[PDB]
Design an enzyme around this catalytic site. Structure first.
Site, PDB file in Angstrom:
ATOM      1  N   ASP A 144      -2.117  -2.438  14.469  1.00 14.67           N
ATOM      2  CA  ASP A 144      -2.716  -3.642  13.982  1.00 14.67           C
ATOM      3  C   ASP A 144      -4.184  -3.492  13.685  1.00 14.67           C
ATOM      4  O   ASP A 144      -4.663  -3.987  12.767  1.00 14.67           O
ATOM      5  CB  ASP A 144      -2.464  -4.747  14.975  1.00 14.67           C
ATOM      6  CG  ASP A 144      -1.247  -5.563  14.644  1.00 14.67           C
ATOM      7  OD1 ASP A 144      -0.527  -5.303  13.730  1.00 14.67           O
ATOM      8  OD2 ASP A 144      -0.995  -6.475  15.309  1.00 14.67           O
TER       9      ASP A 144
ATOM     10  N   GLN B  49     -10.889   1.920   2.974  1.00 14.02           N
ATOM     11  CA  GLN B  49     -11.648   0.704   3.283  1.00 14.02           C
ATOM     12  C   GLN B  49     -12.657   0.850   4.428  1.00 14.02           C
ATOM     13  O   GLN B  49     -13.523  -0.028   4.576  1.00 14.02           O
ATOM     14  CB  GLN B  49     -10.686  -0.429   3.677  1.00 14.02           C
ATOM     15  CG  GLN B  49      -9.940  -1.043   2.532  1.00 14.02           C
ATOM     16  CD  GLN B  49      -8.950  -2.110   3.015  1.00 14.02           C
ATOM     17  OE1 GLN B  49      -7.972  -1.826   3.737  1.00 14.02           O
ATOM     18  NE2 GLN B  49      -9.225  -3.336   2.662  1.00 14.02           N
TER      19      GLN B  49
ATOM     20  N   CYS C  67       0.123  -1.931   0.443  1.00 11.69           N
ATOM     21  CA  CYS C  67      -0.109  -2.445   1.786  1.00 11.69           C
ATOM     22  C   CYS C  67      -0.437  -3.925   1.614  1.00 11.69           C
ATOM     23  O   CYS C  67       0.238  -4.602   0.830  1.00 11.69           O
ATOM     24  CB  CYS C  67      -1.181  -1.613   2.483  1.00 11.69           C
ATOM     25  SG  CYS C  67      -2.712  -1.264   1.496  1.00 11.69           S
ATOM     26  N   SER C  68      -1.508  -4.351   2.083  1.00 12.96           N
ATOM     27  CA  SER C  68      -1.909  -5.737   1.938  1.00 12.96           C
ATOM     28  C   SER C  68      -2.632  -5.983   0.599  1.00 12.96           C
ATOM     29  O   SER C  68      -2.184  -6.738  -0.323  1.00 12.96           O
ATOM     30  CB  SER C  68      -2.847  -6.127   3.011  1.00 12.96           C
ATOM     31  OG  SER C  68      -2.806  -7.482   3.162  1.00 12.96           O
ATOM     32  N   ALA C  69      -3.767  -5.354   0.683  1.00 10.25           N
ATOM     33  CA  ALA C  69      -4.613  -5.389  -0.520  1.00 10.25           C
ATOM     34  C   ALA C  69      -4.321  -4.274  -1.522  1.00 10.25           C
ATOM     35  O   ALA C  69      -4.775  -4.361  -2.680  1.00 10.25           O
ATOM     36  CB  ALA C  69      -6.096  -5.304  -0.131  1.00 10.25           C
ATOM     37  N   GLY C  70      -3.608  -3.231  -1.116  1.00  7.89           N
ATOM     38  CA  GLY C  70      -3.329  -2.118  -2.013  1.00  7.89           C
ATOM     39  C   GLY C  70      -4.488  -1.145  -2.219  1.00  7.89           C
ATOM     40  O   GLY C  70      -4.554  -0.502  -3.284  1.00  7.89           O
ATOM     41  N   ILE C  71      -5.384  -1.000  -1.228  1.00  6.15           N
ATOM     42  CA  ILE C  71      -6.509  -0.073  -1.360  1.00  6.15           C
ATOM     43  C   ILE C  71      -6.760   0.775  -0.126  1.00  6.15           C
ATOM     44  O   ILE C  71      -7.256   1.905  -0.248  1.00  6.15           O
ATOM     45  CB  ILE C  71      -7.809  -0.804  -1.779  1.00  6.15           C
ATOM     46  CG1 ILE C  71      -8.245  -1.856  -0.752  1.00  6.15           C
ATOM     47  CG2 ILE C  71      -7.626  -1.405  -3.157  1.00  6.15           C
ATOM     48  CD1 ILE C  71      -9.612  -2.566  -1.088  1.00  6.15           C
ATOM     49  N   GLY C  72      -6.433   0.274   1.069  1.00  8.30           N
ATOM     50  CA  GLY C  72      -6.786   0.993   2.289  1.00  8.30           C
ATOM     51  C   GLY C  72      -5.770   2.018   2.765  1.00  8.30           C
ATOM     52  O   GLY C  72      -5.904   3.221   2.466  1.00  8.30           O
ATOM     53  N   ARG C  73      -4.744   1.559   3.510  1.00  9.39           N
ATOM     54  CA  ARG C  73      -3.599   2.438   3.817  1.00  9.39           C
ATOM     55  C   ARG C  73      -3.004   3.070   2.557  1.00  9.39           C
ATOM     56  O   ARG C  73      -2.641   4.259   2.562  1.00  9.39           O
ATOM     57  CB  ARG C  73      -2.514   1.661   4.574  1.00  9.39           C
ATOM     58  CG  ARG C  73      -3.023   1.087   5.892  1.00  9.39           C
ATOM     59  CD  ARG C  73      -1.992   0.176   6.551  1.00  9.39           C
ATOM     60  NE  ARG C  73      -2.607  -0.677   7.559  1.00  9.39           N
ATOM     61  CZ  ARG C  73      -1.946  -1.604   8.247  1.00  9.39           C
ATOM     62  NH1 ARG C  73      -0.650  -1.792   8.028  1.00  9.39           N
ATOM     63  NH2 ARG C  73      -2.582  -2.359   9.151  1.00  9.39           N
ATOM     64  N   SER C  74      -2.890   2.297   1.473  1.00 12.07           N
ATOM     65  CA  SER C  74      -2.336   2.831   0.214  1.00 12.07           C
ATOM     66  C   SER C  74      -3.183   3.972  -0.330  1.00 12.07           C
ATOM     67  O   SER C  74      -2.654   4.961  -0.877  1.00 12.07           O
ATOM     68  CB  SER C  74      -2.235   1.714  -0.843  1.00 12.07           C
ATOM     69  OG  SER C  74      -1.254   0.734  -0.521  1.00 12.07           O
TER      70      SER C  74
END
Ligand code: JNG
Length: 282
Positions: free
Chosen positions: A181, A262, A215-222
């Site tokens: 999380d 991020q 992912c959520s925003a499509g920039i960090g984990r992605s």
């Protein structure tokens, strides 16, 4: 410098912040006028995360062609990826319309539907075989066929039907279920394993359309996902594998989508994963 001792020595002086900031300071800036039209406001999860005009994916329709999604095209590596936000309830149909039109074989999901007590993305696929989903606005049908639940990820087998032409296609849903999380994983093992399972299916291959990742925003984990794959693929391709510069690779990728990676923690994990996967698959 070889990427292993930049790492041992960034931890040591501990300048992770410092390094990550220069990347933000040097990253490309290109316009996003379409994303910022009033008529698309409701189509964006976040106000500060938008696709560049030059690299955005367009839906094929006269209506409104807008989706928050970017095509990342890696030239030397010969790999392409579509990075997108996790879909909203009002955008689910656009998401699958995009998967159909770009001819993708796999969808890769790096987050849980709910994390930290809030909704991270819509429940956009069916959970029981006998209960199919239908996207009315884009005239598509989606059926669950099978699923394999393992301890750090799940794989689903889905059927997408274009109801206008009655053609059907098989889509693979690769769902990494255990990123925490808060923060990043401590070891990259399982992430590494997930990544090779996606390669093995043929989803990242040229015989298909680009893989859709999010992912959520499509920039960090992605962004970690695509950076890692590309760095490991470049390593095997060059005469000297040590010549690969990950910061160089990340800045290239940020020509196509803003904000990839991020936090500095995420930057670190990226190096860590690349260093480790180098020495194994080698
Ligand atoms: O946030 C959602 O539930 C979907 S996005 C959306 C936002 C505002 C409005 Cl008025 C409609 C959809």
């Amino acid at each position: 410098m070889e990427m292993e001792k930049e790492f041992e020595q960034i931890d040591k002086s501990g300048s992770w912040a410092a390094i990550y900031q220069d990347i933000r300071h040097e990253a490309s800036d290109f316009p996003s006028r379409v994303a910022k039209l009033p008529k698309n406001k409701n189509r964006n999860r976040y106000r500060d995360v938008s696709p560049f005009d030059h690299s955005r994916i367009k839906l094929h329709q006269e209506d409104n062609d807008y989706i928050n999604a970017s095509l990342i095209k890696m030239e030397e590596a010969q790999r392409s990826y579509i990075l997108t936000q996790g879909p909203l309830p009002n955008t689910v149909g656009h998401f699958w319309e995009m998967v159909w039109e770009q001819k993708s074989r796999g969808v890769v999901m790096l987050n849980r539907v709910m994390e930290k007590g809030s909704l991270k993305c819509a429940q956009y696929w069916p959970q029981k075989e006998e209960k199919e989903m239908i996207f009315e606005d884009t005239n598509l049908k989606l059926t669950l066929i099978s699923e394999d639940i393992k301890s750090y990820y799940t794989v689903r087998q889905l059927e997408l039907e274009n109801l206008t032409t009655q053609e059907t296609r098989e889509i693979l849903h690769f769902h990494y279920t255990t990123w925490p999380d808060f923060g990043v994983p401590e070891s990259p093992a399982s992430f590494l394993n997930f990544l090779f399972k996606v390669r093995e299916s043929g989803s990242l291959s040229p015989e298909h359309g680009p893989v859709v990742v999010h992912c959520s925003a499509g920039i960090g984990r992605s962004g970690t996902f695509c950076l890692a794959d590309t760095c490991l693929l470049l390593m095997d391709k060059r005469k000297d594998p040590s010549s690969v510069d990950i910061k160089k690779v990340l800045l290239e990728m940020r020509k196509f989508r803003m904000g990839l990676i991020q936090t500095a923690d995420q930057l670190r994990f990226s190096y860590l994963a690349v260093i480790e996967g180098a020495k194994f698959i080698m």
